């Protein structure tokens, strides 16, 4: 019941046409594509190969960011707030580095 905010495709449209409209369809139909990938790639659903050189930095960073956001959640839970202020500023530092 979503549609891609970049190319407007709906998931029923995707069922009919059989091709993704743009890069963002992948993010906005993530759940539903996994059965299709499973059928098409002999049960595989995650990429285990090349990463482009320029952007690889960016994605390494974003992975760190997500690990620290989860660690921040756990730190808030424990009422460990000085550590949380550190982790918040580190996330902010990495996000600035991206853009």
């Amino acid at each position: 019941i979503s549609a891609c905010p970049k190319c407007g495709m709906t998931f029923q449209q995707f069922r009919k046409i059989g091709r993704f409209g743009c890069s963002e369809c992948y993010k906005t139909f993530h759940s539903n594509i996994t059965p299709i990938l499973r059928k098409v790639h002999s049960g595989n659903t995650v990429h285990a190969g090349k990463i482009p050189k320029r952007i690889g930095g960016n994605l390494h960073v974003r992975r760190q960011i997500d690990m620290l956001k989860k660690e921040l959640e756990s730190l808030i839970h424990q009422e460990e707030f000085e550590n949380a202020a550190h982790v918040r500023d580190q996330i902010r530092l990495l996000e600035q580095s991206l853009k």
Partner: protein, 233 residues
């Protein structure tokens, strides 16, 4: 020519890519299409990649129809592209490595080499890929990999193929049992007069190094079996 000029007619590597920030060819506008081909003309059309040579952009709109005929029959371009008013082919003067633009995907890097030379072809496709990627934000995603129009190509975006002439294997009737064996090893062989083409069944899950290694091992075993059967008759 080629290493096994007798057995394997060619080794092909095909890498499908897409621009991240441009809609795929299923949804994109004509402005977006002409802009892709314009960007390629501006930063790659008369540029060299050492070892591989000078690239030149052939736009479909400006091509002679018989010129389109020649590119099609050399497998540098698919027929759908000849009538596209926006497609393109960036060819090396060598002509072994070509880059098709604005077809099913924005970019398709092709390396067609004559002998049994999968890993060289792979190396050149990688060089070309790295070269384009320093000017093109590729449609990439950490869980899925390289993002493609069809779901059958997502991930490595890589199709690897080998063309083989196996007259002796067909004649010794071994071909029948070999074909299911090839298919269970995750390879698809389609027969196309004793010419067969083996290629990778999947594109996501394996790594490219391993896709090419798997195809390469299997082809090499078929080469040895064919030389044996020919020595027999």
């Amino acid at each position: 020519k080629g290493p096994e000029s007798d057995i394997v007619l060619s080794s092909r590597i095909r890498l499908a890519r897409n621009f991240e920030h441009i809609r795929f060819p299923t949804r994109y506008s004509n402005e977006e299409a002409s802009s892709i081909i314009q960007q390629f003309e501006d930063q790659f059309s008369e540029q060299e990649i050492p070892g591989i040579g000078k690239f030149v952009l052939i736009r479909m709109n400006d091509a002679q129809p018989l010129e389109k005929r020649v590119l099609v029959e050399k497998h540098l371009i698919s027929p759908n592209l000849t009538e596209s008013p926006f497609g393109g082919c960036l060819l090396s003067e060598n002509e072994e490595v070509s880059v098709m633009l604005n077809e099913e995907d924005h970019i398709r890097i092709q390396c067609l080499f004559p002998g049994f030379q999968l890993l060289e072809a792979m190396k050149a496709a990688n060089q070309v890929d790295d070269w384009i990627e320093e000017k093109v934000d590729y449609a990439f995603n950490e869980q899925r990999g390289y993002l493609t129009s069809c779901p059958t190509n997502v991930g490595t975006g890589l199709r690897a193929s080998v063309m083989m002439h196996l007259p002796a294997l067909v004649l010794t009737r071994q071909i029948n049992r070999i074909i299911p064996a090839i298919n269970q090893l995750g390879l698809v062989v389609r027969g196309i007069g004793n010419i067969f083409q083996i290629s990778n069944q999947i594109t996501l899950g394996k790594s490219e190094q391993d896709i090419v290694e798997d195809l390469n091992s299997v082809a090499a075993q078929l080469i040895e079996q064919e030389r044996s059967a020919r020595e027999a008759i």
